[PDB]
Write a protein that holds these residues in place. Structure first.
Motif, PDB file in Angstrom:
ATOM      1  N   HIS A   1     -21.263 -38.945 -45.903  1.00  0.00           N
ATOM      2  CA  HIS A   1     -19.771 -39.144 -45.376  1.00  0.00           C
ATOM      3  C   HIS A   1     -18.970 -38.888 -46.519  1.00  0.00           C
ATOM      4  O   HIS A   1     -17.795 -38.274 -46.455  1.00  0.00           O
ATOM      5  CB  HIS A   1     -19.809 -40.441 -44.857  1.00  0.00           C
ATOM      6  CG  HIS A   1     -20.795 -40.876 -43.758  1.00  0.00           C
ATOM      7  ND1 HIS A   1     -21.128 -39.943 -42.832  1.00  0.00           N
ATOM      8  CD2 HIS A   1     -21.475 -41.977 -43.505  1.00  0.00           C
ATOM      9  CE1 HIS A   1     -21.892 -40.565 -42.071  1.00  0.00           C
ATOM     10  NE2 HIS A   1     -22.201 -42.122 -42.499  1.00  0.00           N
TER      11      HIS A   1
ATOM     12  N   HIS B   1     -21.100 -44.067 -33.381  1.00  0.00           N
ATOM     13  CA  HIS B   1     -20.513 -43.836 -34.646  1.00  0.00           C
ATOM     14  C   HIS B   1     -19.658 -42.462 -34.562  1.00  0.00           C
ATOM     15  O   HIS B   1     -20.102 -41.194 -35.209  1.00  0.00           O
ATOM     16  CB  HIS B   1     -21.573 -43.389 -35.757  1.00  0.00           C
ATOM     17  CG  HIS B   1     -22.319 -44.599 -36.104  1.00  0.00           C
ATOM     18  ND1 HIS B   1     -23.616 -45.138 -35.896  1.00  0.00           N
ATOM     19  CD2 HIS B   1     -21.652 -45.617 -37.243  1.00  0.00           C
ATOM     20  CE1 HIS B   1     -24.058 -46.113 -36.554  1.00  0.00           C
ATOM     21  NE2 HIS B   1     -22.715 -46.616 -37.193  1.00  0.00           N
TER      22      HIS B   1
ATOM     23  N   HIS C   1     -21.549 -38.278 -38.784  1.00  0.00           N
ATOM     24  CA  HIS C   1     -22.591 -39.043 -38.152  1.00  0.00           C
ATOM     25  C   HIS C   1     -23.427 -38.419 -37.256  1.00  0.00           C
ATOM     26  O   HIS C   1     -22.803 -38.104 -36.115  1.00  0.00           O
ATOM     27  CB  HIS C   1     -22.315 -40.606 -37.912  1.00  0.00           C
ATOM     28  CG  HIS C   1     -23.128 -41.618 -38.238  1.00  0.00           C
ATOM     29  ND1 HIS C   1     -24.569 -41.621 -37.351  1.00  0.00           N
ATOM     30  CD2 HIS C   1     -23.211 -42.436 -39.112  1.00  0.00           C
ATOM     31  CE1 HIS C   1     -25.268 -42.305 -37.766  1.00  0.00           C
ATOM     32  NE2 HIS C   1     -24.657 -43.041 -38.904  1.00  0.00           N
TER      33      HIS C   1
ATOM     34  N   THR D   1     -20.671 -49.230 -46.994  1.00  0.00           N
ATOM     35  CA  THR D   1     -20.642 -49.336 -45.701  1.00  0.00           C
ATOM     36  C   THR D   1     -22.343 -49.202 -45.217  1.00  0.00           C
ATOM     37  O   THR D   1     -22.736 -49.360 -44.214  1.00  0.00           O
ATOM     38  CB  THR D   1     -19.834 -48.309 -44.761  1.00  0.00           C
ATOM     39  OG1 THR D   1     -20.240 -47.141 -45.186  1.00  0.00           O
ATOM     40  CG2 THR D   1     -18.573 -48.777 -45.205  1.00  0.00           C
TER      41      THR D   1
ATOM     42  N   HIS E   1     -15.459 -43.264 -43.397  1.00  0.00           N
ATOM     43  CA  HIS E   1     -16.562 -43.670 -43.596  1.00  0.00           C
ATOM     44  C   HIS E   1     -17.932 -43.316 -42.780  1.00  0.00           C
ATOM     45  O   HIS E   1     -19.160 -43.398 -43.186  1.00  0.00           O
ATOM     46  CB  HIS E   1     -16.571 -45.369 -43.592  1.00  0.00           C
ATOM     47  CG  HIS E   1     -16.696 -45.890 -42.257  1.00  0.00           C
ATOM     48  ND1 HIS E   1     -15.725 -45.820 -41.320  1.00  0.00           N
ATOM     49  CD2 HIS E   1     -17.777 -46.661 -41.710  1.00  0.00           C
ATOM     50  CE1 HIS E   1     -16.331 -46.454 -40.368  1.00  0.00           C
ATOM     51  NE2 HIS E   1     -17.619 -47.063 -40.388  1.00  0.00           N
ATOM     52  N   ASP E   2     -17.827 -42.834 -41.606  1.00  0.00           N
ATOM     53  CA  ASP E   2     -18.998 -42.367 -40.855  1.00  0.00           C
ATOM     54  C   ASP E   2     -18.948 -40.694 -40.520  1.00  0.00           C
ATOM     55  O   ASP E   2     -19.671 -40.377 -39.721  1.00  0.00           O
ATOM     56  CB  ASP E   2     -19.161 -43.293 -39.898  1.00  0.00           C
ATOM     57  CG  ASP E   2     -19.905 -44.368 -39.789  1.00  0.00           C
ATOM     58  OD1 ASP E   2     -20.928 -44.299 -40.698  1.00  0.00           O
ATOM     59  OD2 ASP E   2     -19.853 -45.399 -39.231  1.00  0.00           O
TER      60      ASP E   2
ATOM     61  N   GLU F   1     -24.526 -42.235 -46.011  1.00  0.00           N
ATOM     62  CA  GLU F   1     -23.301 -42.710 -46.501  1.00  0.00           C
ATOM     63  C   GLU F   1     -22.843 -41.711 -47.709  1.00  0.00           C
ATOM     64  O   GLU F   1     -21.637 -41.416 -47.986  1.00  0.00           O
ATOM     65  CB  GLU F   1     -23.174 -44.075 -47.154  1.00  0.00           C
ATOM     66  CG  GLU F   1     -23.465 -45.061 -46.039  1.00  0.00           C
ATOM     67  CD  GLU F   1     -24.752 -45.132 -45.427  1.00  0.00           C
ATOM     68  OE1 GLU F   1     -25.864 -44.935 -46.161  1.00  0.00           O
ATOM     69  OE2 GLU F   1     -24.895 -45.589 -44.115  1.00  0.00           O
TER      70      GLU F   1
HETATM   71 MG   LIG Z   1     -22.275 -45.525 -41.604  1.00  0.00          MG
END
Ligand SMILES: [Mg+2]
Ligand SMILES: Cc1nc(C)c(CNc2nc(OCCCc3ccc4ccccc4n3)nc(Cl)c2C)s1
Ligand SMILES: [Zn+2]
Length: 322
Positions: free
Chosen positions: A149, A79, A121, A187, A117-118, A146
């Protein structure tokens, strides 16, 4: 609190031009960004310009945004920054092939959402954060990472000269931030199964209406899952190397649990390595294939993703059989 890029990072990106050999293959669904690390920020700018146009975002603000997004991605095995650009490229390919179905607001929101989106992470699943009561799980009860994010995306936009959407009206700005929110939450793989089920029913009963906003959000949701899993749609050598990265992150998570005297599930246990080909075949059969099958039904030009996904599945069967 957010990490911001240096003047030299975003000013450097402003200059960069994509090599002409990539102009045709970047358009393809199976395109791998992997061998072009130094170009990734430039590839994202290229995709925004080729898709939306050169004047959709003030180049300065866009280059500041990209370079700050890159800085807020950690050195985790999977990620990471590479994954963000890979996901955004899959979205780029989908949008280009379905050029008359999405608004200019959706097209720019989705490309940004995919890159963010990540964001930040930590290389840990929602289950890990929740089980071991990490501050993030105490903050966001469901879709833990999420929520973080989308929070990391908003905080980046709110930095000095990072608001790429500042030129939009208050209504259009709230609209794009909503598209991003929903796209990033989608996601969370746990949410995908129900979303795809609802979409399959709407398609089969002929009740799927792209005019209906709730229906649209669901299609966008599946597009986000399809992009998130796109490593299964690359050529076998690329797919195989990305699987090593995914498992390196899974195993590092299990090593952490083991350190605490907790037995991780086989998927996160490096001592259960031999089970990976079978594990992959089940993932392709229960998650990836239904995903691309439903996506191809709703959006027929996305068919190459289903075709490549099926090619990798037979490669995994070949590994299981020797
Ligand atoms: Mg994710
Ligand atoms: C680090 C990541 N977090 C998420 C949420 C990710 C989702 N995206 C994928 N997830 C998987 O999971 C495959 C595991 C399947 C599995 C089952 C059981 C096993 C038992 C033993 C050994 C391996 C076993 N593997 N494969 C692919 Cl190709 C993708 C793109 S990756
Ligand atoms: Zn992802």
């Amino acid at each position: 609190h957010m990490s911001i890029c240096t003047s030299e990072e975003w000013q450097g990106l402003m200059q960069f031009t994509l090599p002409v050999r990539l102009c045709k293959e970047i358009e393809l669904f199976h395109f791998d960004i992997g061998p072009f690390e130094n170009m990734w920020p430039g590839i994202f700018v290229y995709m925004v310009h080729r898709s939306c146009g050169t004047s959709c975002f003030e180049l300065e603000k866009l280059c500041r945004f990209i370079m700050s997004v890159k800085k807020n991605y950690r050195r985790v095995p999977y990620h990471n920054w590479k994954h963000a650009v890979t996901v955004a490229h899959c979205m780029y390919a989908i949008l280009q092939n379905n050029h008359t179905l999405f608004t200019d607001l959706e097209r720019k929101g989705l490309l940004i959402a995919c890159l963010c989106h990540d964001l930040d992470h930590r290389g840990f699943s929602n289950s890990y954060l929740q089980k071991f009561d990490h501050p993030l799980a105490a903050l966001y009860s469901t879709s833990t990472m999420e929520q973080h994010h989308f929070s990391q995306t908003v905080s980046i936009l709110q930095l000095e000269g990072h608001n790429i959407f500042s030129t939009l009206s208050s209504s259009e700005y709230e609209q794009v931030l909503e598209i991003i929110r929903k796209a990033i939450i989608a996601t969370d793989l746990a949410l995908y199964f129900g979303n795809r089920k609802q979409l399959e029913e709407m398609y089969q009963t002929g009740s799927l209406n792209l005019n209906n906003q709730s229906h649209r959000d669901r299609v966008i949701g599946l597009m986000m899952t399809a992009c998130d899993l796109c490593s299964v749609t690359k050529l076998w050598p690329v797919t195989k190397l990305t699987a090593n990265d995914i498992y390196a992150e899974f195993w590092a998570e299990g090593d952490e649990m083991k350190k605490l005297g907790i037995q991780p599930i086989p998927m996160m246990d490096r001592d259960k390595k031999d089970e990976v080909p079978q594990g992959q075949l089940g993932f392709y059969n229960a998650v990836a294939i239904p995903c691309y099958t439903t996506l191809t039904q709703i959006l027929p030009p996305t068919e190459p993703l289903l075709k490549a996904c099926r090619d990798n599945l037979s490669q995994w069967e070949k590994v299981i059989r020797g």
